[PDB]
Design an enzyme around this catalytic site. Structure first.
Site, PDB file in Angstrom:
ATOM      1  N   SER A 105      38.723  -4.857  23.147  1.00  0.00           N
ATOM      2  CA  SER A 105      39.344  -4.708  21.987  1.00  0.00           C
ATOM      3  C   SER A 105      39.445  -5.950  21.307  1.00  0.00           C
ATOM      4  CB  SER A 105      40.805  -3.782  21.952  1.00  0.00           C
ATOM      5  OG  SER A 105      41.222  -3.632  20.772  1.00  0.00           O
ATOM      6  N   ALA A 106      40.497  -6.526  20.754  1.00  0.00           N
ATOM      7  CA  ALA A 106      40.643  -7.832  20.390  1.00  0.00           C
ATOM      8  C   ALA A 106      40.098  -8.707  21.303  1.00  0.00           C
ATOM      9  CB  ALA A 106      42.054  -8.159  20.210  1.00  0.00           C
TER      10      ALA A 106
END
Length: 302
Positions: free
Chosen positions: A121-122
């Site tokens: 994700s991030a």
């Protein structure tokens, strides 16, 4: 006999990180190092528990470092992949993550040709940034449900990129090549993404490959050699028993070597593929991203 250990430390800038030391580490052989970058809301312990990466580290004899993003730096504990202060070499979170690598190298025997960055994700978007900003450090990267280089440059544009994708991957790939500056080299990339991801839409996983095709095409030595595109050379089918199906695409360079892979997991949401319910944001019905990413890393030293 020896026993593996999952310890914590702080780097000189104060960055907290956890480090898994496999039982086979003895100081007499430099080991590969996998830097794992957790996603939003997570932390080193949760990411280790979900990805099970320390299990593969123990079995295959490699070190695992897990830098921590505190809520003081981002209220969701996301790596600030959408902020220009965190997209360049020598400043912000990229410099801090590189500093974790330097700190591990100072204290442990590390194989400098086998240092990798992977994240969810991030942390997948931040792994992309690590490849673009410190290609001299990271032999290859793994991107679990992430976004292309400079997919956004503000928090408002971040949310738009999560649903629509970032800008033209060709443009972003040229920007990532520019970000490599005087350090440019081909950085092999393995991407995972779920086809039913309603948080970071899968267009982003497709863009990561297209962006890296362009970056790696610019970075390959020679004006008429080492070229690479985003057209899959091989499309292979996968199936987890009692779990999900997936498609695995292989992207070869001009020499016929696989330089990138993309695994689209059918019906998977925003999650690390495979792993354990002991950590958040995993899907044990998907294929084992930790194992497949390690296999890719093994095959792509500097």
């Amino acid at each position: 006999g020896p026993a593996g250990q999952f310890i914590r430390d702080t780097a000189p800038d104060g960055r907290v990180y956890k480090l898994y030391i496999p039982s086979g580490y003895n100081g007499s052989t430099p080991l590969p190092l996998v830097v794992m970058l957790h996603g939003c809301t997570q932390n080193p312990d949760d990411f280790a528990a979900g990805t099970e990466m320390n299990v593969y580290a123990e079995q295959n004899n490699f070190l695992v470092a897990y830098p921590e993003q505190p809520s003081s730096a981002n209220l969701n504990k996301c790596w600030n992949w959408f902020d220009s202060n965190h997209q360049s070499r020598g400043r912000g979170e990229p410099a801090s993550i590189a500093g974790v690598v330097e700190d591990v190298k100072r204290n442990y025997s590390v194989d400098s040709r086998r240092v990798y960055a992977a994240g969810l994700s991030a942390g997948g978007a931040m792994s992309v940034i690590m490849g673009a900003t410190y290609p001299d450090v990271f032999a290859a990267i793994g991107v679990g449900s992430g976004l292309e280089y400079k997919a956004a440059t503000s928090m408002t544009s971040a949310y738009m990129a999560m649903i629509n994708g970032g800008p033209d991957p060709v443009q972003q790939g040229n920007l990532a090549y520019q970000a490599m500056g005087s350090h440019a080299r081909v950085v092999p990339v393995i991407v995972f993404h779920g086809t039913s991801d309603y948080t970071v839409y899968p267009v982003n996983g497709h863009q990561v490959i297209s962006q890296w095709a362009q970056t790696n095409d610019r970075a390959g030595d020679g004006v008429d050699n080492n070229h690479i595109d985003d057209q899959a050379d091989v499309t292979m089918n996968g199936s987890v028993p009692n779990g999900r199906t997936y498609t695995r695409y292989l992207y070869k360079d001009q020499n016929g070597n696989v330089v990138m892979e993309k695994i689209m997991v059918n019906g998977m949401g925003h999650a690390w593929s495979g792993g354990s319910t002991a950590g958040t944001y995993t899907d044990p019905a998907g294929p084992e991203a930790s194992s497949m990413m390690w296999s890719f890393f093994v095959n792509h030293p500097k």
